[PDB]
C-alpha cells in the first residue's frame, strides 16, 4: 500500500505541467521517502507534509482535488508560476494552514467564497494575478490574519467595510486593481495596522478622518487614484508614520500645519496634485525627513529657512510650482544632500555656497528661475557632481575655473544665462563630460584652443553666445556627434582637419563670418547627416565627392558665395532651398542649367 501523503504529492506531480527539472527527484524507489523531496517538509513524527513549496518551478495546469489529503499542512507556496483557472476551492480544506502564498500567477474569475474555513490563517499573499469581480467579504472572518495582499489584479468595486474588523492585521496591500468609490471609514479601526498600500486604483472622495486612529501605521500610500478635496488635517495625529505617499491625485487647498507633528516621517511625496499656498514653516521641525517632494502643484511663497537645516534631508524636489524669494542660505550644510531639483519656479538671489558641503550632491537642477549673481566657486570643488542643469537664469560673471577637476561631471547646461569673458579652458580636460551647452550668453571671446580634445563629449553647443575669432583645429575630436556654433561672429576658414570627427552627425556653423572654402574632409566623414553652413562668406565649389556621401540628409549652404555645379549623387535628391542665394552656383537641381 501507499500513504495518502505520497499519493497526494504524486497527484500534484501529474496534475501540474512544467519542465522535467520541476519534479525530477520526486521519485519513488523499488518508507516516508517523500520527505527527501524538494519543497517538502514533514512532521518528523507522523511523516505528514506540513510545508509545501512549489514556488518558481515554471508550472502550469490546475491544482488537483487530491491536495485536500495534505491535511496537516501549515505553509503553502505556489508563487511565481503559471497556474490558471479559478482559485481551487480544495485549498479551503487544508484547515490547519497558517501561510498561503499564490502570488504571481494567472488565477482568474471571481474569488471563491470559502476562505473562512481556513480559521488559523496568518498570512495570505495573492499579489499579481487575474482575479476580477468583488473583493471577497469572506476574509473578514479571519480573526488571526496578520498580512493580506490582494494587489496587482483586476478586482473591482469598493473595499468591504468589514475588513475593518481584522483586529490583528498588520499589513494590507490592495494596490493596482480597479477598486473604486470611497475609502470606508471603518478601516480606521485596524488597531495593529502598520503598512497600508492601496493606490493605483480609482478611489474617489477624501481620506477618512478616522484613519487618524491608526496609531501604529508606519507606511501609507494611496497615490495614483482619484482622491480630492483638502488633505485631512487629522492625519497629524499619526506619530509613527515614516512614509506618506499621496502623489498623482487631485487634492487641493493648503497643506495642513498639523503635519508638523509627524515626528518620525522620513519620506513625504505630494507630487502632482493641486495644492496651493506655502510650505508650512513647521516642516522645519521634521528632523527625520529625508525625501521631500512637492513636484507639480500650485504652491507658492518662500521656502522656510529651516528646511535648510533639516539634518537628514537627502532629496529635495520642488520643481514646477511658483515659489518666490531665495533658497535657504544654509541648504546643504547638513552634509547629506544628494539631489536637488527646483526648476521652473521664480526663485531669486544667489545659489548657496554650501549645497555640496559633504561631497554627496550628484544632481543639481536649477533651470528656469531667476537665480542671479556669480556662479559659486564651491561647485567647482563639488567632488561628486554628475548632472548640472542651470539654463534660463540670470547668472553673470566669468564661469569659474575648476569644473575640469570633477571626475564624475557628465552633463552641464549653463545656456541662456548672462555669463561673460573667457570660457574655462579646463572644460576641454574634464574626464567624462558628455554634454555641454553654453548657448545664448555674452562671452565676447574665442573658443578655448583645446576644446576639441575633450575625450568623451558628444554634444557641444555655444550657438548665439558672442564668440569671436577662429574655430580651433579639430585635433583628435574623439567622441563628438553634435556641434552647434550658429549665430556667432566666427571668422577665418572652417578647419581643414574636420575629418578627425569620425562620429560627427550634425554640424551647425551657420550665421557666422566664415570664409574660404568648404573643407574637403567633410566628404570622408562616415556618418555625417546634417550640415548647415548657411549665412556666411564661403567661396569655392561644393566638392564633387560629396555626391557619394551616402549618409547626408541635410546640407544647407544657402546665402553664401559659392560657385560651380551642385554635385550629383545623393545631392540629386535634396531640397533646392539649400542652394539659394549663391549667384555663381548652378545645376539642374536648382533650375539654372550649367553652361
Amino acid at each position: 500500500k501507499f500513504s495518502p501523503q505520497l499519493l497526494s504529492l504524486l497527484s500534484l506531480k501529474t496534475s501540474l505541467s512544467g519542465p522535467p527539472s520541476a519534479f525530477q527527484d520526486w521519485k519513488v524507489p523499488v518508507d516516508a521517502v517523500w520527505c527527501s523531496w524538494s519543497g517538502v517538509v514533514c512532521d518528523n513524527v507522523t511523516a505528514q507534509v506540513i510545508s509545501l513549496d512549489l514556488s518558481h518551478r515554471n508550472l502550469s495546469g490546475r491544482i488537483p482535488i487530491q491536495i485536500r489529503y495534505l491535511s496537516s499542512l501549515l505553509y503553502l507556496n505556489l508563487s511565481g508560476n503559471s497556474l490558471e483557472g479559478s482559485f481551487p476551492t480544495s485549498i479551503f480544506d487544508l484547515t490547519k494552514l497558517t501561510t498561503l502564498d499564490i502570488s504571481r500567477n494567472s488565477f482568474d474569475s471571481s474569488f471563491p467564497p470559502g476562505i473562512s474555513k481556513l480559521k488559523f490563517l496568518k498570512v495570505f499573499n495573492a499579489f499579481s494575478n487575474n482575479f476580477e469581480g468583488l473583493l471577497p467579504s469572506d476574509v473578514s472572518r479571519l480573526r488571526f490574519l496578520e498580512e493580506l495582499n490582494f494587489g496587482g489584479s483586476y478586482f473591482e468595486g469598493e473595499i468591504p467595510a468589514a475588513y475593518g474588523g481584522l483586529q490583528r492585521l498588520k499589513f494590507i496591500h490592495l494596490a493596482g486593481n480597479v477598486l473604486g468609490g470611497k475609502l470606508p471609514p471603518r478601516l480606521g479601526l485596524l488597531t495593529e495596522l502598520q503598512h497600508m498600500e492601496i493606490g493605483y486604483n480609482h478611489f474617489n472622495g477624501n481620506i477618512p478622518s478616522e484613519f487618524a486612529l491608526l496609531s501604529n501605521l508606519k507606511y501609507f500610500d494611496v497615490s495614483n487614484c482619484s482622491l480630492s478635496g483638502s488633505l485631512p488635517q487629522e492625519l497629524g495625529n499619526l506619530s509613527n508614520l515614516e512614509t506618506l505617499f499621496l502623489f498623482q491625485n487631485g487634492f487641493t487647498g493648503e497643506i495642513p500645519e498639523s503635519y508638523s507633528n509627524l515626528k518620525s516621517l522620513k519620506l513625504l511625496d505630494f507630487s502632482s496634485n493641486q495644492l496651493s499656498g506655502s510650505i508650512p514653516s513647521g516642516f522645519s521641525t521634521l528632523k527625520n525627513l529625508t525625501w521631500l517632494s512637492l513636484i507639480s502643484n500650485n504652491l507658492s511663497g518662500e521656502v522656510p529657512e529651516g528646511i535648510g537645516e533639516l539634518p537628514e534631508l537627502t532629496t529635495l524636489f520642488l520643481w514646477n510650482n511658483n515659489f518666490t524669494g531665495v533658497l535657504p542660505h544654509k541648504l546643504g550644510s547638513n552634509g547629506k544632500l544628494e539631489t536637488m531639483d527646483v526648476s521652473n519656479n521664480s526663485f531669486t538671489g544667489t545659489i548657496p555656497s554650501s549645497l555640496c558641503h559633504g561631497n554627496k550632491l550628484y544632481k543639481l537642477i536649477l533651470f528656469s528661475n531667476m537665480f542671479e549673481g556669480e556662479l559659486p566657486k564651491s561647485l567647482t570643488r563639488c567632488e561628486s557632481l554628475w548632472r548640472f542643469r542651470s539654463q534660463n537664469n540670470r547668472l553673470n560673471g566669468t564661469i569659474p575655473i575648476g569644473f575640469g577637476s570633477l571626475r564624475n561631471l557628465t552633463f552641464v547646461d549653463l545656456s541662456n544665462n548672462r555669463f561673460t569673458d573667457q570660457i574655462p579652458a579646463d572644460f576641454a580636460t574634464a574626464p567624462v563630460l558628455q554634454y555641454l551647452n553654453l548657448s545664448t550668453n555674452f562671452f565676447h571671446r574665442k573658443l578655448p584652443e583645446n576644446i576639441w580634445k575633450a575625450p568623451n563629449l558628444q554634444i557641444f553647443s555655444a550657438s548665439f553666445s558672442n564668440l569671436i575669432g577662429e574655430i580651433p583645429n579639430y585635433v583628435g575630436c574623439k567622441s563628438f556627434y553634435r556641434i552647434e556654433l550658429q549665430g556667432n561672429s566666427l571668422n577665418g576658414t572652417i578647419p581643414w582637419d574636420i575629418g578627425h570627427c569620425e562620429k560627427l552627425l550634425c554640424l551647425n556653423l551657420s550665421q557666422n563670418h566664415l570664409n574660404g572654402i568648404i573643407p574637403w574632409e567633410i566628404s570622408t566623414l562616415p556618418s555625417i547627416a546634417d550640415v548647415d553652413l548657411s549665412h556666411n562668406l564661403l567661396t569655392g565649389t561644393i566638392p564633387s565627392d560629396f555626391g557619394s556621401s551616402k549618409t547626408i540628409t541635410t546640407f544647407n549652404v544657402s546665402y553664401n558665395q559659392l560657385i560651380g555645379p551642385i554635385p550629383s549623387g545623393s545631392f540629386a535628391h535634396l531640397n533646392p532651398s539649400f542652394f539659394s542665394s549663391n549667384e555663381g552656383l548652378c545645376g539642374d537641381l536648382v533650375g539654372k542649367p550649367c553652361n
Partner: peptide, 12 residues
C-alpha cells in the same frame, strides 16, 4: 501584473 511602489520616480 506589476504595480509601482515607492516615491514618484519622475526626473529632470
Amino acid at each position: 501584473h506589476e504595480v509601482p511602489s515607492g516615491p514618484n520616480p519622475i526626473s529632470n
